Structures are given as C-alpha cells and as structure tokens.
Amino acid sequence: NYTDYFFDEPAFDLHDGGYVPLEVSDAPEKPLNVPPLLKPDKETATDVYYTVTAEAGETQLLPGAKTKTWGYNTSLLGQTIVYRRGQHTHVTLKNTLPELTTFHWHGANVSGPYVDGGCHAPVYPGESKHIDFTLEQPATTLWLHAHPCPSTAEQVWHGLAAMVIVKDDHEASLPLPRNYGVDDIPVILQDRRFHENNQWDYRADYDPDGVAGPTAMINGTINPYFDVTTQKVRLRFLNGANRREWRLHFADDLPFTQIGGDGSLLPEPVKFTHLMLTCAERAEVIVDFGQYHEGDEVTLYTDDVPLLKFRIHAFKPDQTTLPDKLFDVKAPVVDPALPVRHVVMQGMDEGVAIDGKKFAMQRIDATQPIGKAQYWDVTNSNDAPGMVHPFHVHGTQFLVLSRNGHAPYPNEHGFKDTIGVNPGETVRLLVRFDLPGVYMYHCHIIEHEDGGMMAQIETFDP
Amino acid sequence: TDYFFDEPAFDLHDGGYVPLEVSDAPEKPLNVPPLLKPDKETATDVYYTVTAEAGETQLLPGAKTKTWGYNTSLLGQTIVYRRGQHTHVTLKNTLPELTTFHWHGANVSGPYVDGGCHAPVYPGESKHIDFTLEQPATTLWLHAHPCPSTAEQVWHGLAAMVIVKDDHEASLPLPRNYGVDDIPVILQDRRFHENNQWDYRADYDPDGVAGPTAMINGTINPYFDVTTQKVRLRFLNGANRREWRLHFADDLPFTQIGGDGSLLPEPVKFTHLMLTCAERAEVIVDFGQYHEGDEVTLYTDDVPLLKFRIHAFKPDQTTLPDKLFDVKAPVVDPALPVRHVVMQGMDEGVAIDGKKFAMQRIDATQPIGKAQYWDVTNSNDAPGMVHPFHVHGTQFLVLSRNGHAPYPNEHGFKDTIGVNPGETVRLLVRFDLPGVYMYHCHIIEHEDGGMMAQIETFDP
Ligand SMILES: [Ag+]
Ligand SMILES: [Ag+]
Ligand SMILES: [Cu+2]
Ligand SMILES: [Cu+2]
Ligand SMILES: [Cu+2]
Ligand SMILES: [Cu+2]
Ligand SMILES: [Cu+2]
Ligand SMILES: [Cu+2]
Ligand SMILES: [Cu+2]
Structure with missing residues (x-):
C-alpha cells in the first residue's frame, strides 16, 4: 500500500491546511467543449498570420445565469492556435478587455521581453500590438495565457488561457491520433468556485498559497463526457489550475502511454495507470479503449472524484503499435567555463x-x-x-x-x-x-x- | 452658474452620469479620523508607522463593509508633518495585494520616496523612508499608487489626509483645534451592493467610476457639532471622477484661505465652490448669525452632504488679515522652451x-x-x-x-x-x-x- 504517483505523498496538496476538496456538480452532464481550431487570416507554406483578441463575455456553465468570463477569440479560454516549426508566424494581439493584459506564449522559444509577452509586454484596453517569430523547437503542446505582474492569477481565473499546438516534420511521421476534435483532444484541467448567479469572485476566494474551488472545469465545461469513435484516443493534458494538482487515473486502472511532455516528445513511450501533474505541466497520452463495448462509459478520475466520462461507440480495430523510440533527445554539452x-x-x-x-x-x-x-x-x-x-x-x-x-x-x-x-x-x-x-x-x-x-x-x- | 468652471463641461452632463441620491441610512456624527500618534517625536525628528490594512466598517445598517485603510479599517489617521523636521516613516503592507504609498503634493525625491508606480510594497513586507519637507503649510494626502490599479485601491478606501505645519501658518488667526473646529472633509462617493459591499469591477467605467451614495470621512449622512463661531474645513476631493459643487443653505458665505500647496496670497469669499479630483481647498465658515439648535446644511448641487448643528459658542471677534501669504514666484529660465x-x-x-x-x-x-x-x-x-x-x-x-x-x-x-x-x-x-x-x-x-x-x- 504505497502511492501510485512519482511525487512525495506527504507533500501533496490534499495535505494542505486550507485544502479545498473537489465536489461533483449537479449540473447536467454535457459534451466536452472542444475549442475550435483558430482559423488564420492568411496562410502560405512559409508564413502564417493570426489575430488573437482578448475579450470579455458570458458563458453558459451552470443552469441559470451565464458566467462572466474572459477568453481569446471566444468568451472562455480560447481557440486552439496551430504553429509550425520553421514557419514565419505573424500575430496581431488585440485587447478588448476593460483591463490591461499581456500575451505570454508559455513554452515558446521566442525573444524577450516583448515577443515572449511577460511582465514587460503590456497591452492596454483598445490597442493592438504586432509580433512575429519563427519557432525552432520540436513539436509539442504549449499554451497562451495572460501574464501581467500582478495579477496573472486573476486574469487566468477570468478565463484567459488557450492551448497552442506546435507541429513539425518528425511528429507528423509517427503513427499517432491527430484528427483534432475526434481522436486528439485538449484536456485543459482547471477548478473554479461558483458564487451567486453562477459568477466567479477571484478576490473573495483569494488565498496567498493558492486559489482552488470545488468545481472541476475541463475546457470550460462542467460534468463533461466525450464520445469515443476510435479505438485509440490522444489526450493532451494541461494543468491550467492556479494551484491544484491532478492525480489522474481511470476508475478501473485502464493503462495509458505518455508520448509527450512540456517541450517535446518523450524519447520513449512510458506506460501509466496513474499520472500526477503540477501547475503548467503538459502530458500527451494515448488511451486504448479496445477492451470496451458500445454503450460502456469509462470514467477518468482525479483522486476519488470523477472528471471526464468517455462514452464508447463503435470503432474500427486499430492494429498500429508505437515505435520503441519516439524522438532523439540531443543533449547540449554543458559549458565547462560556467559554474553551477x-x-x-x-x-x-x-x-x-x-x-x-x-x-x-x-x-x-x-x-x-x-x-x-x-x-x-x-x-x-x-x-x-x-x-x-x-x-x-x-x-x-x-x-x-x-x-x-x-x-x-x-x-x-x-x-x-x-x-x-x-x-x-x-x-x-x-x-x-x-x-x-x-x-x-x-x-x-x-x-x-x-x-x-x-x-x-x-x-x-x- | 456660480462656479468658475465651464458649465457645459460639468460631470452632470456626462453620458453615463450617475446622480447622487440621499441614503435612507440614519444620520450620525461625522467620523473625524484621529491624528496618527508618532512612535517617537523630538523637535528635530519624528517617526511614524503607516500600516495599510484590511477590515470591516459599519457604513449602512446590516452587514459591515469590507474596506481598506491606513492604521484603521477605512481611510486613515490624519498624519502631521512639520516643515524642516526630519521625518522617518515605516511603510507596512498587511493587505492581500501589493500597494504603494504616494504622498500627493509632497516635495520629496522620486521614484521611491514619492511612492508612485515604481515603489511597490508586497504583502507582509516593510519599507523605510526618510525626508524633510521644505514647503509651506497646506493640506496634502496619502493614497495607493500602483500602475495599475490606483482606482481599485482608492475605492477600497486607501486615502488619508496629511497636514503640513509651519511657523507662518501658526502665526495666523485660524481655527486649528483638530476635530473641534478644524476638521477634514474628505468628499467621496460609493455604490453599495448586496450586504453593503463595494465592487469596483462591477461598477467599472473607462471614463470614471461614480456611485450614488456620498461618503464624507467614511460616513453616510454625517452631522457635525459646531461648538465655536468659526470652523475650518479642509476639503479634499477623494473621488475617482466626481466634481463637488459646494454651497450652504441660505447661501452662507465662506472664505478660502488655502489650496493644494499653500495658503492663498489673500482670502477669497465664496458662496459656491467647485473642486475637481485631488484638489484641496481650506475654508473658514462663520456661524455667528446662528443660534442654539440651528441646522445648516452643506450641499453639493441639490444634494445634502453634511449637517452642521449649531450650539452655543463664545463670540470670535478675530478678522483675517488682508494678506495671508507672500507668493515668491520663480523667474522662468529664459534659455528654455515652452x-x-x-x-x-x-x-x-x-x-x-x-x-x-x-x-x-x-x-x-x-x-x-x-x-x-x-x-x-x-x-x-x-x-x-x-x-x-x-x-x-x-x-x-x-x-x-x-x-x-x-x-x-x-x-x-x-x-x-x-x-x-x-x-x-x-x-x-x-x-x-x-x-x-x-x-x-x-x-x-x-x-x-x-x-x-x-x-x-x-x-x-
Ligand atoms: Ag503551503
Ligand atoms: Ag466623458
Ligand atoms: Cu505559464
Ligand atoms: Cu511561461
Ligand atoms: Cu511566467
Ligand atoms: Cu493623487
Ligand atoms: Cu501625486
Ligand atoms: Cu500620480
Ligand atoms: Cu482624464
């Protein structure tokens, strides 16, 4: 009887003094929101042009009143942004919020401080900025979120985060689910606390060691289920919470294989039944649902709380098998003149x-x-x-x-x-x-x- | 119009103007902020601790309002500074957010002592400043100045009056008994939500935030007991946007003696005075024509703010001199562009x-x-x-x-x-x-x- 996770069981958040347990919402179960792929304004093989617009609006999350939310090219989270290695990327950053924000490309090998979009790249209400860059890094899952200093927390809580997919030649060659929305889906893991009229109040729920509410929220959805129409499904896990740790496992310890981390493919596939993620970490996994039958529902859980239901439909067999080696990690050589x-x-x-x-x-x-x-x-x-x-x-x-x-x-x-x-x-x-x-x-x-x-x-x- | 400003440009013509409404809340004594007691004071030095803190204040009946203040739950204790005295202040931040300590109107170095955008003080930490004011007697104030949001923090309630004393102002026949005949009049407005709580972001407007409830020294429907013939009022516009158009019942006159940075060269009589954000004006009111039990109301436009309850008082037979202060204008450097x-x-x-x-x-x-x-x-x-x-x-x-x-x-x-x-x-x-x-x-x-x-x- 040991922990199933790699991290130190006593350090886990569930042992914190102000720990907030997740609670199951009574909200109706509904299909997992898969954010649209953001359509570029123009695209050639050498260049891509995007407009990304921070914006305040309203989203139906619980029954009754709509929740005031922020988002990118949408009222909550954002449209998923596809970037390619070696492609000259051009982005118009537009702020239509009542507050100044920042556009941070978490994980992007880009110049700073302006392109990077951290504390020193402010963008006031009403104004636009223009950035351009060519990523020279491996395929992976990154993400976009606000990054004023302060308050990054409040703005992310408002709903400013969006999955960013980076494509390359090597990753395209591998036998992997890649039909976005069908067998390859974002799983942005967050929590929230809903107050009167189903609204959020970051400042009411403020805690200096981390803000967490009882209600899990996946891709801006409450009590999500996902309809499986393929044997293999690719899950791109992102911990977009402000502090909560996700200890992920299916009800019946259904195996999955991690193929990616934050910044690249893993060198080799790694089998899991139990996966822990701290804030900002990503993990791409392949789940095989071949042992199940039509109508069955396999549930993904964090600790003892159900997160995401997978409704199993008819699918054609998938015979394909992952290579021993996914990716060649070329480690730099440490500069010997430099100290530790x-x-x-x-x-x-x-x-x-x-x-x-x-x-x-x-x-x-x-x-x-x-x-x-x-x-x-x-x-x-x-x-x-x-x-x-x-x-x-x-x-x-x-x-x-x-x-x-x-x-x-x-x-x-x-x-x-x-x-x-x-x-x-x-x-x-x-x-x-x-x-x-x-x-x-x-x-x-x-x-x-x-x-x-x-x-x-x-x-x-x- | 009785006011000097351009009547068409007044706030009450703005697009989303919010008229003041009189609260149903009961009348109560005007809160007079205590004077901040120094840690240690000599004739050459003074040592203060200014603590930004979060708490609760009874403003309307029912639940208390969650507010911010300096050395109190709302606004702040009135801080006294002397010209030429080495001042030593310790800034302590016990808020859940970072803030700043700006001394609006203080000739002090920048950007750290000034306490503007570049002088952050995090939760739990302290900073130490020292300075010596070489400027005349006047009324300044202290308030939060993160960039942003100054407006949110001022709304929460971080403002306090600051009095600069000097030898010239001491030698004048002025009401100077703090809280008895020399009072702050900090003019603000707020919108009260459910459970009497403020909510800046709900009320937000890019052209300025104004709520319908007037708040004077963190008091709703204040009255003040006059126990002298002459009373000195230190007007401060601590609102986010709103203009105050001040006048009394009966068009009772008052005399302006000081503005933001100094006494006026000479006294100026008024029946109607208008103030924009951050302006201060010091006025003497004379109630010698009034008697035991008379009430005199101070209005902004057509709205009552403050009720002065006249009591019996000794006759004050002092008249103000023709000249209050000498204004020594610098000469422009001629070698310098406009x-x-x-x-x-x-x-x-x-x-x-x-x-x-x-x-x-x-x-x-x-x-x-x-x-x-x-x-x-x-x-x-x-x-x-x-x-x-x-x-x-x-x-x-x-x-x-x-x-x-x-x-x-x-x-x-x-x-x-x-x-x-x-x-x-x-x-x-x-x-x-x-x-x-x-x-x-x-x-x-x-x-x-x-x-x-x-x-x-x-x-x-
Ligand atoms: Ag802790
Ligand atoms: Ag306007
Ligand atoms: Cu990040
Ligand atoms: Cu980052
Ligand atoms: Cu960062
Ligand atoms: Cu100011
Ligand atoms: Cu100032
Ligand atoms: Cu300023
Ligand atoms: Cu302006």
Missing part, C-alpha cells in the same frame, strides 16, 4: 521569495550567455508544511538531469519548461537560451508568482 | 502627447531648480470633461487660462488644475529634487487607462 547556478525557492504565504528577494520589475537577478548550456540546481526549501513547487523558466526548454542526486521521474527524459520540486529537494536542470532577452523564472503556483516568487535573468551574446 | 502637454481622448483612447503610459519610458526631462512654462491642453470638446491635471514632486503656480486670468483661488501654489475642454492653461513649474515623477489626469480611471507620462529631473 543555485536557485532557492523559499517561504510560504506572503513570505515567498527566490534567493532571498521578492520580484522587482526594474532589477535583473541573473545573466547567462546565449548558446551556452549550464547546470541549474533548483531547491524547494519549504519544510514539513511542504508544497510541490512547479518551477518554470521563460524562453527555453531544459533537460532534467537529477532529483536529489537520483534519476529523474520516468516521464522526465524529454524537454520540459516546468518541473515540480518536492519539499526539501534539489533538482538539477541543464539550461540553454537560444535568443537574447529578459526571461522570468518562477514558481507556477500563480498566487506565489504574483506574491514575489519570481525573478528574472538576462541573456546576452558574447 | 513645454506643451496635450491630454487627449476619452474612454479607452486616453493618452498624453499621443502615447499611453509605459513604465520603462521617460517622456520628458527638466533640470532641477529651473522654472519652465508648461502649456497644458485638454483636447476633447463637445463630450467634454474637466481634466484635473497633476504633476508629482512639485508645487506650480497658475499663470493663465486661455490667455486670461486664472480663477480667483489659483494665485497660491497648486499641484492639480482642472482644465476645461479645449482649454490651454499655462503653469510655472520648477522641480527642487532629482527623480522620476509622473504627471497625469487625476480622474483615476484615465490614470489607470494610460493618461499618464513620466518626467526625469537632473542636476545641470
């Missing part, structure tokens, strides 16, 4: 800090040359009252070398931008920035990021 | 010189100790608002309005001027200290919407 960087995440509540300091806009906390790989030792110092801190770094994809001198977890051998650090643990990352800019590095529990557990590094060309 | 500042737009198109505020961008420079002319224009006409233009880290003089005389109460030092639609005012502006100072419209929703720039001052 030590980053200590510390404190809790309003005490949060990185290397003894709260985030300041005008202060540069670190530098690193472009093109030069470096070992980062990252430490979560919190003691017994412990929390798994998802450490994130803008403008790169790192490799995970060790966890307390031991091997990294079996699903951490590919490229990642976010790694959960257990209380007391030091992890070692191999980090390289390709481009010049100012990039944030922070805990992706968003309430702590708004509270000062954020710092910034400047990359430069020698 | 600075043209244009406030444009309304709603989401608010801008200054065609640009929205960028926290990394310096829009202007000026040498310390050299007075320059500032021509400030308000472009919007037809749908027009009186824009109260404000400059950090200085006290300017008003030279002209559209090439004509300034208003009768603009011959003193000021930090905030109401500019009518289409109007160019000329200011004479000098900066004593080096720093980075914001200048902006003080209709706060425009401030937050980007009608703001920043100037940098340097030693030549």
Whole structure:
C-alpha cells in the first residue's frame, strides 16, 4: 500500500491546511467543449498570420445565469492556435478587455521581453500590438495565457488561457491520433468556485498559497463526457489550475502511454495507470479503449472524484503499435567555463521569495550567455508544511538531469519548461537560451508568482 | 452658474452620469479620523508607522463593509508633518495585494520616496523612508499608487489626509483645534451592493467610476457639532471622477484661505465652490448669525452632504488679515522652451502627447531648480470633461487660462488644475529634487487607462 504517483505523498496538496476538496456538480452532464481550431487570416507554406483578441463575455456553465468570463477569440479560454516549426508566424494581439493584459506564449522559444509577452509586454484596453517569430523547437503542446505582474492569477481565473499546438516534420511521421476534435483532444484541467448567479469572485476566494474551488472545469465545461469513435484516443493534458494538482487515473486502472511532455516528445513511450501533474505541466497520452463495448462509459478520475466520462461507440480495430523510440533527445554539452547556478525557492504565504528577494520589475537577478548550456540546481526549501513547487523558466526548454542526486521521474527524459520540486529537494536542470532577452523564472503556483516568487535573468551574446 | 468652471463641461452632463441620491441610512456624527500618534517625536525628528490594512466598517445598517485603510479599517489617521523636521516613516503592507504609498503634493525625491508606480510594497513586507519637507503649510494626502490599479485601491478606501505645519501658518488667526473646529472633509462617493459591499469591477467605467451614495470621512449622512463661531474645513476631493459643487443653505458665505500647496496670497469669499479630483481647498465658515439648535446644511448641487448643528459658542471677534501669504514666484529660465502637454481622448483612447503610459519610458526631462512654462491642453470638446491635471514632486503656480486670468483661488501654489475642454492653461513649474515623477489626469480611471507620462529631473 504505497502511492501510485512519482511525487512525495506527504507533500501533496490534499495535505494542505486550507485544502479545498473537489465536489461533483449537479449540473447536467454535457459534451466536452472542444475549442475550435483558430482559423488564420492568411496562410502560405512559409508564413502564417493570426489575430488573437482578448475579450470579455458570458458563458453558459451552470443552469441559470451565464458566467462572466474572459477568453481569446471566444468568451472562455480560447481557440486552439496551430504553429509550425520553421514557419514565419505573424500575430496581431488585440485587447478588448476593460483591463490591461499581456500575451505570454508559455513554452515558446521566442525573444524577450516583448515577443515572449511577460511582465514587460503590456497591452492596454483598445490597442493592438504586432509580433512575429519563427519557432525552432520540436513539436509539442504549449499554451497562451495572460501574464501581467500582478495579477496573472486573476486574469487566468477570468478565463484567459488557450492551448497552442506546435507541429513539425518528425511528429507528423509517427503513427499517432491527430484528427483534432475526434481522436486528439485538449484536456485543459482547471477548478473554479461558483458564487451567486453562477459568477466567479477571484478576490473573495483569494488565498496567498493558492486559489482552488470545488468545481472541476475541463475546457470550460462542467460534468463533461466525450464520445469515443476510435479505438485509440490522444489526450493532451494541461494543468491550467492556479494551484491544484491532478492525480489522474481511470476508475478501473485502464493503462495509458505518455508520448509527450512540456517541450517535446518523450524519447520513449512510458506506460501509466496513474499520472500526477503540477501547475503548467503538459502530458500527451494515448488511451486504448479496445477492451470496451458500445454503450460502456469509462470514467477518468482525479483522486476519488470523477472528471471526464468517455462514452464508447463503435470503432474500427486499430492494429498500429508505437515505435520503441519516439524522438532523439540531443543533449547540449554543458559549458565547462560556467559554474553551477543555485536557485532557492523559499517561504510560504506572503513570505515567498527566490534567493532571498521578492520580484522587482526594474532589477535583473541573473545573466547567462546565449548558446551556452549550464547546470541549474533548483531547491524547494519549504519544510514539513511542504508544497510541490512547479518551477518554470521563460524562453527555453531544459533537460532534467537529477532529483536529489537520483534519476529523474520516468516521464522526465524529454524537454520540459516546468518541473515540480518536492519539499526539501534539489533538482538539477541543464539550461540553454537560444535568443537574447529578459526571461522570468518562477514558481507556477500563480498566487506565489504574483506574491514575489519570481525573478528574472538576462541573456546576452558574447 | 456660480462656479468658475465651464458649465457645459460639468460631470452632470456626462453620458453615463450617475446622480447622487440621499441614503435612507440614519444620520450620525461625522467620523473625524484621529491624528496618527508618532512612535517617537523630538523637535528635530519624528517617526511614524503607516500600516495599510484590511477590515470591516459599519457604513449602512446590516452587514459591515469590507474596506481598506491606513492604521484603521477605512481611510486613515490624519498624519502631521512639520516643515524642516526630519521625518522617518515605516511603510507596512498587511493587505492581500501589493500597494504603494504616494504622498500627493509632497516635495520629496522620486521614484521611491514619492511612492508612485515604481515603489511597490508586497504583502507582509516593510519599507523605510526618510525626508524633510521644505514647503509651506497646506493640506496634502496619502493614497495607493500602483500602475495599475490606483482606482481599485482608492475605492477600497486607501486615502488619508496629511497636514503640513509651519511657523507662518501658526502665526495666523485660524481655527486649528483638530476635530473641534478644524476638521477634514474628505468628499467621496460609493455604490453599495448586496450586504453593503463595494465592487469596483462591477461598477467599472473607462471614463470614471461614480456611485450614488456620498461618503464624507467614511460616513453616510454625517452631522457635525459646531461648538465655536468659526470652523475650518479642509476639503479634499477623494473621488475617482466626481466634481463637488459646494454651497450652504441660505447661501452662507465662506472664505478660502488655502489650496493644494499653500495658503492663498489673500482670502477669497465664496458662496459656491467647485473642486475637481485631488484638489484641496481650506475654508473658514462663520456661524455667528446662528443660534442654539440651528441646522445648516452643506450641499453639493441639490444634494445634502453634511449637517452642521449649531450650539452655543463664545463670540470670535478675530478678522483675517488682508494678506495671508507672500507668493515668491520663480523667474522662468529664459534659455528654455515652452513645454506643451496635450491630454487627449476619452474612454479607452486616453493618452498624453499621443502615447499611453509605459513604465520603462521617460517622456520628458527638466533640470532641477529651473522654472519652465508648461502649456497644458485638454483636447476633447463637445463630450467634454474637466481634466484635473497633476504633476508629482512639485508645487506650480497658475499663470493663465486661455490667455486670461486664472480663477480667483489659483494665485497660491497648486499641484492639480482642472482644465476645461479645449482649454490651454499655462503653469510655472520648477522641480527642487532629482527623480522620476509622473504627471497625469487625476480622474483615476484615465490614470489607470494610460493618461499618464513620466518626467526625469537632473542636476545641470
Ligand atoms: Ag503551503
Ligand atoms: Ag466623458
Ligand atoms: Cu505559464
Ligand atoms: Cu511561461
Ligand atoms: Cu511566467
Ligand atoms: Cu493623487
Ligand atoms: Cu501625486
Ligand atoms: Cu482624464
Ligand atoms: Cu500620480
């Protein structure tokens, strides 16, 4: 009788003092919302042009009154944005909100601070900005969300997040579900607390160690079910919550195989029955429903709470099988002239800090040359009252070398931008920035990021 | 119209104007904020702790209203500063959000002491500032200044009066007994929601937020017990947008003695006085013609704000002198261009010189100790608002309005001027200290919407 998850059972959120259990909503079960693929304004093989518009509106979530929500090219979350490697991407960023926002491309190898779209890329109500870039990184699932400093939390809670899919030649060649909306779906995992008139009140539910409500919400849907019409289904899991951790497993321990992480395909497929994700992490998995019959419903659960029902229909057999090797991880060579960087995440509540300091806009906390790989030792110092801190770094994809001198977890051998650090643990990352800019590095529990557990590094060309 | 401003441009002609309505709530004594007791005070030094905190205040019957304040649940204890005295303040933030501590109208360095956009104080942390004011006696105030949102934080209730004492003002025949005959009159409005709670974002409007319930020193339907013949009222417009058009029953006269940055050169009689956001005006009222039990109401437009209950009082036979203060105007540096500042737009198109505020961008420079002319224009006409233009880290003089005389109460030092639609005012502006100072419209929703720039001052 042990935990089924890789992380440290005592550190789990369910052990927190102000832990909010998930509760099942009485709302009607309804089809999972699959956000439309965002149609480009114009597209050639060399160039793509998109308009992305932050906007306030209303969404039917619970029965009765509609919930006031924000979203991208929609009233909640966003239309899914497809980018291609090597394709000159051109984006118009339009803000029609009553408040100034930011357009952060979490996981995008792009310049900073302006394209990156973090704390220093404000966009006022009414005005537009124009960005352009060519991603040179592997196929993966990234995402877009707001990133004012503060409050990233409030804006994400309002509903500013959208899945971003990055396509490439290698990933296209592999035998994988790719029919978006049919056998390949977003699974954006969030929670909310609904107040009177089914409205949200971030500030009423504020907690300095993380905001979480009882009602799970997947792709802006309550009590979702999904209609399976293929044997294999591809799930792109994104933890878009402000603090909650998802411990994912089917009711009957139905196996699934993870094929992707944050920043790339995994080098090899990894079989799971139980998958934990901290804030901002992604995991792409293939589920096989071949043992089931028409009419059966297999339910996906987080801990002991049902999240997502899969209604099984008729499907043609799928004989295909995954290769031993999905992707070639080309590790950089550490620059020997560089020392080891030590980053200590510390404190809790309003005490949060990185290397003894709260985030300041005008202060540069670190530098690193472009093109030069470096070992980062990252430490979560919190003691017994412990929390798994998802450490994130803008403008790169790192490799995970060790966890307390031991091997990294079996699903951490590919490229990642976010790694959960257990209380007391030091992890070692191999980090390289390709481009010049100012990039944030922070805990992706968003309430702590708004509270000062954020710092910034400047990359430069020698 | 009895007021100096342009009647067509008044707020009550605005598109989504919100008229004040009188609350059904019972009459009660005007809250007079206590004077903040120093930690330690000598003749050369003073040491304060200012704590921004969150709590609950009984404002209407039923549930309490969740508010913010400095060293209290709502607004703040009145802070006293002396010219030439080394002041030592400790800023403590116990709010669940980050904030700022701006000393509106204080000649202090920027950008840290100024406490503008660049001076964040996180939850749980403390900062330490020290300074010495070399400016005349007047009424300043303290309030939150994150960029953004100043408007949200001021709404929550973060404002407090600040009194600057000096030797000249002490020597004058003025009511000076705080809370007895020398009172704050902090003029605000609010909209009360279910369970008497405020909700800024529900009430939001890009052209300014106004609610229908007047609130004076965090009091609803206040009355004040007059126990002297003369009473000094320190008017402060702490509203987000609303203009106050002040007058008494019977058209009882009052005398303005001071404005934002100084006593007026001479006293100015009024029956009707108008104030835009962030303006302060100090007036003496005389109730010598009234008797035991008489009530005199102070109105904005047709709406009662404050009831003065006259009691028996000793006759006060003192008259004010012809001259209150000497205004020593700096001379323009002749080698220096006229600075043209244009406030444009309304709603989401608010801008200054065609640009929205960028926290990394310096829009202007000026040498310390050299007075320059500032021509400030308000472009919007037809749908027009009186824009109260404000400059950090200085006290300017008003030279002209559209090439004509300034208003009768603009011959003193000021930090905030109401500019009518289409109007160019000329200011004479000098900066004593080096720093980075914001200048902006003080209709706060425009401030937050980007009608703001920043100037940098340097030693030549
Ligand atoms: Ag904790
Ligand atoms: Ag208007
Ligand atoms: Cu992110
Ligand atoms: Cu990011
Ligand atoms: Cu970030
Ligand atoms: Cu101010
Ligand atoms: Cu100011
Ligand atoms: Cu304005
Ligand atoms: Cu200001």
